[PDB]
Amino acid sequence: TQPLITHLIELRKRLLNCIIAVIVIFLCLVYFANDIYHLVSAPLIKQLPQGSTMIATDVASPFFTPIKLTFMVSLILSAPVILYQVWAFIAPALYKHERRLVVPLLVSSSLLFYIGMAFAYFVVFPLAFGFLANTAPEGVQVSTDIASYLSFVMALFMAFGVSFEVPVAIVLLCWMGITSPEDLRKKRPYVLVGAFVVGMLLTPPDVFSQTLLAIPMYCLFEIGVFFSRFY
Amino acid sequence: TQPLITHLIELRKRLLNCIIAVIVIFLCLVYFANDIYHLVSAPLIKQLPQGSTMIATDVASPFFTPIKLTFMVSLILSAPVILYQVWAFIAPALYKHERRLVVPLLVSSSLLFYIGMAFAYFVVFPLAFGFLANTAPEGVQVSTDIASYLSFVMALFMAFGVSFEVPVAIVLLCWMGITSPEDLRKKRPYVLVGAFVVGMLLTPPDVFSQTLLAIPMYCLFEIGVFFSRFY
Amino acid sequence: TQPLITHLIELRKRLLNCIIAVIVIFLCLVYFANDIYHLVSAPLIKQLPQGSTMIATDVASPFFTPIKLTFMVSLILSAPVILYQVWAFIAPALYKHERRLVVPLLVSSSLLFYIGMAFAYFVVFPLAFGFLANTAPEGVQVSTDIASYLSFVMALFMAFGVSFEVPVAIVLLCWMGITSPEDLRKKRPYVLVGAFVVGMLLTPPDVFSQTLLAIPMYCLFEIGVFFSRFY
Amino acid sequence: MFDIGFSELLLVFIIGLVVLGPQRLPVAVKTVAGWIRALRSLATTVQNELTQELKLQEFQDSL
Amino acid sequence: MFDIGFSELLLVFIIGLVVLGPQRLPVAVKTVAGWIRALRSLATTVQNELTQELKLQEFQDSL
Amino acid sequence: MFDIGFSELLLVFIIGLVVLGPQRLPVAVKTVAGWIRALRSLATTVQNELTQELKLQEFQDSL
Known about the structure:
The complex is a heterohexamer, with three copies of chain A and three copies of chain D. By secondary structure, chain A is mainly α. Chain A contains nine helices and three strands. Chain A has a two-stranded parallel ribbon. The interface between A and B is medium-sized, with 21 and 23 residues. Chains D, E, F: It is found in: Cell membrane; Membrane. Chains D, E, F: This is Sec-independent protein translocase protein TatB.
């Protein structure tokens, strides 16, 4: 017995609940795999050029890719459950009265992720696909692979969900006791290198992708510092 | 002289024989590069939907992919030659009269790989392609890349050839002296983790693929233990 | 102060100049992103089979791939600027009168890179694409992806630019004082393994690609030794 | 791994050198290396105490 | 590198913890680490023994 | 990463063994390992010397 054994006993139970939640939601939505794909592909299908459709270059892509969507959809849907068990596992270590503040904070951090995906799906996806599709060089047929589209969609959903949380996170820390606008301003050079490091570990091994995802993070950090001054 | 130099002298000769066997078989089949690819693609072409053909998204794919298949066709064809040299290199270390038992065993392990490939080609390939091709979401054109098809096809041949050997390997070890059904039942939890590790080192960096290849190995281990009790 | 701090102060300035040179050229050519792509894709378009065009399987490929090409084109265009700053940073360490010889040598190494690119574009590209495009198996439609075409084109430009410099480099070292044909002939086995290792670090993780790029390096090293004897 | 590349790693060195300079970048490398040391210190401690709780507790019940 | 991924490595820890529990998984890690120690011991022995066969035999003929 | 793979690494050992043989390949491995030692020696010297130039000079001006 004793600690460092019961901790994994608790973590095993919490991990099982996250696995159970993911599986249960996935099984419920496994039947409507193409229906979610139709919703996801609707912003692109509307903006696709005339004569251009979606294609499947992989043998198992017609079946696995919609199933891959449903598994990721279950992960996002079960995120409050996953975050609850992580909080509960670290709850005994947060008896210092900081537990009261983090209970709604994690709840508030969940809507911001969903609002970011809704903003990307409703505002950005029609605008991005309306430009990316109808900008190909002459003689180039835009036949978007459904496997590559899912990765692009999930990258943007992750990017925009994280993007919405950053300014509010900066403001909340800079509001009460943790940081001040002066401290975050003097850490500006280190965030720029940190943005490249974070982007490098999140983007595929391509210098263009890391250079392109890191700048928004610095931009999101910049507005958050700007907003914290208006407190 | 002395050992650890003659050993690599012997291994150098065995490696040369395996290299020569691969090259000789490859050169014989290098002229019929498209003929084998037509045989390989025939299960998919028959089940391809109307208006759907195979495509080549890579510049050198129309010529490299048939060439790639022939090289890896020669590897399977030269596997008995390759396995003979590996056995011969370890033959002096197996003078304990275990050499007699392993000579048929390695030979018997060769047809099982080929029977698994034949089973996949003649039974599974028409069934899988007849379902995977005609299951795409609405508005999706199944234009399978010949480069991605080769990787998918050879993974299934590797999967089924290894799949056929596992139950017979388990039964043989559980038959004479090595293991018993009771021992393999108490190692069930470790095989489950081992299957995930083996799949992780064999599947591309995708959590979906590792989770999908690991389960068959556990299933193959399960039936092998079941068959060993019927000894 | 003192060395190892002023050295990075100098390297910081030289790195800035390379960055500014790349950005300035990229911004000038960023507007004509498709025009350079049309020039790059012209050899393939001319030799494409009837009914076969270029496709874009990636969502952001129609916009990013022309943007990516201009970025790498700026890198090659700014290579004389990049090489100048690298030489200048190591110039104080080359006060042994070897600085005089390397000023034209680095300059002469710049045209050879461009001549190799011109040779690949004008001589090899029409010949290679005329064969690769019109060699697909029956029932296979050559739908070349624009993203994969850029990687193929960039690798060939890099390969031929490096290919042209190697024989002249061998002759130059074998000419004055550094090496002799006898020394490079006795290092033939080590270059063959070195070619495979270099092939590892430049080709994607595919055994066919490393085996296919390494042989030209050994061939280029072979002719350079042959030409050094005619000195 | 987290999609590690060559040009990706060189950029951070190039970007880090320009942004930080030869007065803050070496401190960042030392500070980052300190985090790795802390992780190794935590890993070294956790692994030893984890074994020290499994083997002795099982062996103590045997006695 | 056999196509190692981040989520792929986390799953083995997640699957391993659930299947094995906090009583068999740490023993498995120690057992797995013991295999690496044997490989390092074999690598250390082979490298020195192979060198002890090339250099000394060649040098002995010189004498 | 410079796109490292499994079959690519096995080929170098296979090609290296055939081309070099068991009389030149182990010397090549030792020679290659010496280059890594030199890089570590340069890295060890540079890291300590750079620290001894940044920290000491800043502290000296304080005195």
